[PDB]
A paper describes a structure:
The non-LEE encoded effector protein B (NleB) has GT activity and inhibits NF-κB activation by transferring N-acetyl glucosamine (GlcNAc) to host death domain-containing proteins and to glyceraldehyde 3-phosphate dehydrogenase (GAPDH). The glycosylation target is an arginine residue, which was unexpected because the guanidine group of arginine is nucleophilically poor at physiological pH. The T3SS effectors SseK1 and SseK2 from Salmonella typhimurium SL1344 are NleB orthologs that behave as NleB1-like GTs, although they differ in protein substrate specificity. Here, by using a combination of X-ray crystallography, STD-NMR, enzyme kinetics, molecular dynamics simulations, and in vivo experiments, we show that these enzymes are GT-A fold retaining GTs that most likely follow an SNi mechanism.
SseK2 was solved both in its unliganded form and in complex with UDP and UDP-GlcNAc. Therefore, the electron density map for this domain was not resolved. However, in the structures with UDP and UDP-GlcNAc, the substrate leads to an unambiguous electron density map for the C-terminal lid domain, implying that the domain is well ordered only in the presence of the nucleotide (detailed information is described below). To obtain insight into the importance of these residues in substrate recognition, we conducted in-silico docking of the acceptor Arg to the SseK2-UDP crystal structure. It was observed that a closed conformation of SseK2 structure possesses a putative acceptor substrate binding site pocket that is connected to the anomeric carbon of GlcNAc. As a result, the negatively charged pocket of the concave active site interacts with the positively charged guanidine group. In particular, Glu271, the β-phosphate of UDP, and His260 were located in a position suitable for hydrogen bonding. In the docking structure of SseK2, a single negatively charged residue (Glu271SseK2) and an additional β-phosphate from UDP are in close contact to the guanidinium group of the acceptor Arg. In addition, His260SseK2 is located near the guanidinium group of the acceptor Arg.
Author numbering: 40 to 263, 267 to 348
The structure:
Amino acid sequence: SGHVSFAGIDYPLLPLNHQTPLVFQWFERNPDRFGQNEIPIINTQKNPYLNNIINAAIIEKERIIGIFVDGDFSKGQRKALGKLEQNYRNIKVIYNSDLNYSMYDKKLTTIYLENITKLEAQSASERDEVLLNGVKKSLEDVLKNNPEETLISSHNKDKGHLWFDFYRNLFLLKGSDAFLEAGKPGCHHLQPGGGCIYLDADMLLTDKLGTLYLPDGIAIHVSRHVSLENGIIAVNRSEHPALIKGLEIMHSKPYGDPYNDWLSKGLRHYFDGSHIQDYDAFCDFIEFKHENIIMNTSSLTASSWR
Ligand SMILES: O=c1ccn([C@@H]2O[C@H](COP(=O)(O)OP(=O)(O)O)[C@@H](O)[C@H]2O)c(=O)[nH]1
Ligand SMILES: [Mn+2]
Ligand SMILES: [Mn+2]
């Protein structure tokens, strides 16, 4: 089939051709735990993530593989990453510090003040006073600590998994163009404004992915308890409107979460804005399926961070 229907609208299954890059992510809070000529990506028995990425790059010889990284790497570590690129010619290491996200950012004071205004406009007998008090307290804390704090500066390495989760969605807004923005060589056959297939490093490829066909060019991982998840996110284009929708939630909500609000609500509110379908049906509609991936293998060994 070439179309699917959800919540009463028809969506074509759009192709992600075999060009579309795969993108893995490694944000490393403590790069000093690696040797200074060591690639600073976890590669232990239980979390053999660098090996997994390499095996994927070997399988997908013909496709660009991004490794989207962040952390205070040494010069030695940057050189070992360069060397990985020399060794597997399809691997492109993208440093988060080389990308500009200011077009997606918002100040926290701004967000807090907009919410406080809105709540204070509601009657005392109508409104959520606990939230109003909590937002006021968060505003007081930001003004004391760093008035210029933004969404993006706030989702930093001291925030655990929120660091990588937040910047993963930002990367997906940029799509393939991020390779070019970061100055990576040999990326000029990527489609301008094109997409990417983001995978957690424990999503093991056992053969070639081929061409994918996704509804409105987007799909994400579903775990089965059935939940949306962020460990696979595929888009066929930059600034996918469903992801822009979720960013709008992040810009409006105090305490927006990259998984629960940006990804999960953004996509659901985009595709089922009136909430006429079951969360489970949405999951079936959006699910990224592929027989040549063994999904979320950390769940059968151990999480690399939980
Ligand atoms: O220190 C960390 C730990 C995890 N991750 C990212 O989080 C993903 C998921 O990690 P894992 O599968 O270990 O976590 P879980 O399945 O428990 O969410 C990894 O592939 C990385 O992209 C990261 O960037 N830095
Ligand atoms: Mn259910
Ligand atoms: Mn996992």
